[PDB]
Amino acid sequence: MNPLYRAAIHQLFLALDLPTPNDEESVLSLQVGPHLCHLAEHPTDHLLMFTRLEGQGDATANEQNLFSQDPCKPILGRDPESGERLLWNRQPLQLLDRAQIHHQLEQLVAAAEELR
């Protein structure tokens, strides 16, 4: 676990009133209501967040996949050798504050709920 990522994860967990983790397990998981969300550093110095969709619709996928003013707007993709649909966003860590780390997760959960 690189220091920027560790610091970012600790900022997020503070914002979530959670016991700061843990081992230095790189990939973390959070259950936020109905949504199982995964956090990773991928690649180095980037905070990736993603959630697998459990049989939502994707009729709105191509609108979801257009850029907006918000770099954290999630993108809806599919694992080619699994068929699973994943909603994801990512920010570089060389730039962030806590409000911006929490915001990334807000955006992820919101899009998953609002999808389609």
Binding site: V27, L28, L30, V32, G33, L36, H38, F50, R52
Partner: protein, 50 residues
Amino acid sequence: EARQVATPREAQQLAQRQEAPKGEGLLSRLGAALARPFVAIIEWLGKLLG
């Protein structure tokens, strides 16, 4: 309403997925030049981006 849980094995794998590099030497091969597209495209793009 958030709890930390164990990471499923497949999520671990997804979280480090690699694709092979692509486009190496591609810009040098195709070349590039400034473009002057229709004013209409430029103006529309400005409204789209705003």
